[PDB]
Amino acid sequence: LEPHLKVTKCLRLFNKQYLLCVQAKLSRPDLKGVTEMIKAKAILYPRKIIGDLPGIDVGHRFFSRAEMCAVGFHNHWLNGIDYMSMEYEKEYSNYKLPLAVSIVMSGQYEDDLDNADTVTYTGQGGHNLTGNKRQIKDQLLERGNLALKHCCEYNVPVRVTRGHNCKSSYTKRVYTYDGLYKVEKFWAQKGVSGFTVYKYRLKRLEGQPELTTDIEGLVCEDISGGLEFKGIPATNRVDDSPVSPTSGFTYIKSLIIEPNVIIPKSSTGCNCRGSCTDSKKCACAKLNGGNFPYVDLNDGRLIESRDVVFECGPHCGCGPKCVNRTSQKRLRFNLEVFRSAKKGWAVRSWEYIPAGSPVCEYIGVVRRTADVNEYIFEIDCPEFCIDAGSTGNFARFINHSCEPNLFVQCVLSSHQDIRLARVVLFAADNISPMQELTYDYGYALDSVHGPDGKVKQLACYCGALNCRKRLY
């Protein structure tokens, strides 16, 4: 309903289409995804907008030019300048069209000069897309150049987005929306290559969050035993009085099954060699409905949520590299546990997490529900639960949010008993560094009773704009 959630949803839909196109092995699956969105009339803002788009805050990180197209934020996958054409003339009759609404600075034009609050942005045209990427003929005062000129003449602000190189395992580039700028002035001159360029001097508008530039409180060098492939440091910056989250808790990477919990019969598995690629041969694919739920991208990404995912298991002929073993693989990301202000322990990531990437299985002691605090995950896809009260992996440190960036996916691999499914946290969204990882616990309101009939309640502090204010 609320604009941020509408944006979130639109971006999830685009991610789904993208990964489907990657799986279908199409060229430029990023662009194909957008084409799918256009076909489905699923572009969130299908008409041009001057100023801010609801739900896209200053600082918003886009993970591709295509994502910007999918939301309607910037409608060309290539062009630096997006503008209202003469089609908008009647709607904006007090302005002269064309009018620019959004530009992208990606450091591709040799005459661009970036000074943060102040920018000198080269017009479009006469630019080599490839090779040396230099100017190769004169520019003209038309199209985007004319559009920016009209912006200057009418005091119409332009959204400005910067490309940034990333040294990340999976994300090469990111685009940050940096707020509105005015076109202060513009002129023509010879560029550094000797051809005419138009130059647009832009000044960031007041009233916006400051442009941002880009070991402390350490309590534990690694909450895992050295067990996780990547260490998980813990910090308390909130309290002197710095006990570590591991106290009273022992880290395990594997489920422990209680005596009174029954171990289901093992699944038969598939007969593929090496890796499972063909949905015809592979029985595990057949279990998934005739298709692989994971795509082989960035070490494996879930295409979309399901009632249950059927992974290759102990008896499958495939080795550990199989893409249908995606959630079984080692921790892919550098994470941190940190003391929050009033949720206690929290987890965040130090690197980018692509949507569909596994974050972790919820590991603990599998107990019968009848035989049983805060760290119990009921398995429902309820007879059984995972008790991470005293022992488990890092999953138990992940907080609830009413607007989560993770989701829970039931996975079967070693057996076919949905009662005892593996519980795996996957990224629902593309996640940026230092963003807290959260999922929706989904306790129904007024769930726990004392009971004198008295409703025992817990206040929620996810800070989300649509918080419903209660865990239960």
Binding site: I376, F377, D380, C381, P382, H400, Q409, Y441, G442
Partner: peptide, 7 residues
Amino acid sequence: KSTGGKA
């Protein structure tokens, strides 16, 4: 932390 699920 129970609920989930997306056929």
